[PDB]
Symmetry: D2
Subunit: 108 residues, 4 copies
C-alpha cells in the first residue's frame, strides 16, 4: 500500500557529522553514548526538547536507570548541558577543540 510506503520514505534522517563519527572515541564517548546523543537529537526534531531517561531508554537496549546514569555522565563530561532543555552545544565545542589540537599536532 502506497500511502504507507510514502510515509516511511518521508520519515527523515538524523545527520551525523563524519567528524563526530570519526572522533567520538577520543572525546571519551562510547557507542552507547553516541546513540543516546542520536536519540536526543531525534527527540529535539520532533519538538521534545527535555526527554526523560525512560523516553530515551525506550528506544535503546539499556534500562531507564542505566540511561539516567549515562545522561549524568554526559553532563559531567561536558558533552551536553541543560538550559528545561538539553543542548549539544558543548559536544561541538569539545569536538572543535580536539580537531584544532590534532591539526596543530599534525603540522597543521
Amino acid at each position: 500500500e502506497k500511502k504507507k510506503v510514502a510515509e516511511w520514505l518521508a520519515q527523515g534522517s538524523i545527520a551525523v557529522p563524519k567528524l563526530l563519527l570519526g572522533h567520538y572515541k577520543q572525546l571519551g564517548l562510547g557507542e552507547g553514548e553516541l546513540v543516546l546523543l542520536l536519540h536526543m537529537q531525534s527527540f529535539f526534531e520532533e519538538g521534545v526538547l527535555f526527554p526523560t531517561p525512560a523516553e530515551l531508554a525506550e528506544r535503546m537496549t539499556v534500562s531507564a536507570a542505566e540511561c539516567m546514569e549515562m545522561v549524568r555522565r554526559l553532563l559531567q563530561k561536558g558533552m551536553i548541558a541543560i538550559e528545561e532543555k538539553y543542548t549539544l552545544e558543548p559536544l561541538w565545542e569539545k569536538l572543535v577543540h580536539h580537531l584544532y589540537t590534532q591539526a596543530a599536532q599534525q603540522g597543521e
Copy 2:
C-alpha cells in the same frame, strides 16, 4: 575562534532522499522547485511551518513574486498541500507511485 566554528559545525543538514534527487525531473519538477522544497523543509525544521513566498525567496535567486508562482504551480501539480501549514506528503506519494510504475515496467 572556537565557539563560532562549533556553531557552524552544529548547524545541521537537510536530508535529501537519493530517490528524490534521482527522479524529480520525471515528476515534472525543475531544479528551482527542488531547491524551493529544500528551503520549505528547512523552515519546517526551525518551527516555521507556513513561510511566505518572500521568506522563501530571500534565500533564493528568484524574486518574491516569482517564488509565489512556483508555490502555486507546486500546489497545482499535487507536490505539496496546505493543511496554516505546508506538507510534502503528496510529493512522497507521487514519488512512490512513480517508483512502483518504473519497477513494474522494468520487470520488477
Copy 3:
C-alpha cells in the same frame, strides 16, 4: 583560527541516519554498538571502501579488531548485512520493512 582548515572540516559532511532505523534497531535485535558499527561501514562505503576490514572498522570504535570481527560475524548471522566483493545492508532493510509492515497492520494502519 585557520580558514582553509575550517573549510576542510566543514567539507567532511554527514552520514544520514534514517529515523526508521534509529526508531527500531532494538526491536530488530541490534545493540548500540552494532548500530554505530553499521554507521562506520556506511561511512567507508561513502569513501569508496566497499569492504572495510574489522581492523579498519575498529580503529574509530572503542572495541578491539577482534570484537569488531565478532560483531561483523554476528551481523552476517543475524542476516542484517550480507557479502555480495562488498558488504550490503539490504538484508537489514528487508527485516525493517517486514517489521514496519507488521506494526502497521497490528495498528490497523493499512
Copy 4:
C-alpha cells in the same frame, strides 16, 4: 505492494545538504541549478564516481549535457569546485567559510 522492493527503495539513502550551504549559496553567486548540480555530483562521489561526466550529470537534470558542461565550466571558473583525478568542493567551502567569517564580524559575533 512488494517488500524486497520497498526495502531496496529505503536502502538508497539520503544526501545530507548542509544548512549553511542552503542558507548562503545565493550570496556565493550560485543559482538553484548549480546547487542541484553540486548535489548530483555529491551523489556520484558517494557511489564512488569521483569524476562524473556532464552527460552523467545531465541525465537526472532538466538541462542538456551541453548546458551541464557549461555549468561545470562556470563553477570551475567561479572557484566553487576544482579538479585534483577527481572533482572537489573544497573551494566552495573556503568561500563559504570566508563569507561566514565576514558575516560573524559585521554582526559583532566574534
